[PDB]
């Protein structure tokens, strides 16, 4: 078995910026990795394509995944509305870590965040499930449009996404 690789093509106010590819740790968190993989291909009839990064805080992370309410409060998993915290084997060790946003224990939906720094205070509370494989330079460019309160100065969207391998 090989971990799946998924990609997002990012755009800033409709202008293509670049591609970021992620490796998902299906060998350690199969259920969480599968949810993200299926949401990236759009194979269940809904997903990340066309959604945006609604909250970006420089030096911390870029958060996205709300394809429903499109305002930071929505999204859902391929298993229904929410699912359990699979495990917390992996930690928020540095830039590039892919982890799930939530509203407390066992409330995983579709929202996720890409860490741009080590965030150890999130360990044991947020399920880490992948890492940026290529295109970390695109994530750094994205960070430039965020702010301390999270609001972005330009609309950052996932113009296209899918599975590479």
């Amino acid at each position: 078995m090989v971990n799946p690789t998924v990609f997002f093509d990012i755009a800033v106010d409709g202008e293509p910026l670049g591609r970021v590819s992620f490796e998902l740790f299906a060998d350690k968190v199969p259920k969480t990795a599968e949810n993200f993989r299926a949401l990236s291909t759009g194979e269940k009839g809904f997903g990340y394509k066309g959604s945006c990064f609604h909250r970006i805080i420089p030096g911390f992370m870029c958060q996205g995944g709300d394809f429903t309410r499109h305002n930071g409060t929505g999204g859902k998993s391929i298993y229904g509305e929410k699912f359990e915290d699979e495990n917390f084997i992996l930690k928020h060790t540095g830039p590039g870590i892919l982890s799930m946003a939530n509203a407390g224990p066992n409330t995983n939906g579709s929202q996720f965040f890409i860490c741009t720094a080590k965030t150890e205070w999130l360990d044991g509370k947020h399920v880490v499930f992948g890492k940026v494989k290529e295109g970390m330079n695109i994530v750094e460019a994205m960070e430039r449009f965020g702010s301390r309160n999270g609001k972005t100065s330009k609309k950052i969207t996932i113009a296209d996404c899918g599975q590479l391998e």
Binding site: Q63, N102, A103, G109, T119
Partner: peptide, 11 residues
Amino acid sequence: XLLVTVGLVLA
């Protein structure tokens, strides 16, 4: 603060 929540974003 620096949290990543869905619904009630805290300081």
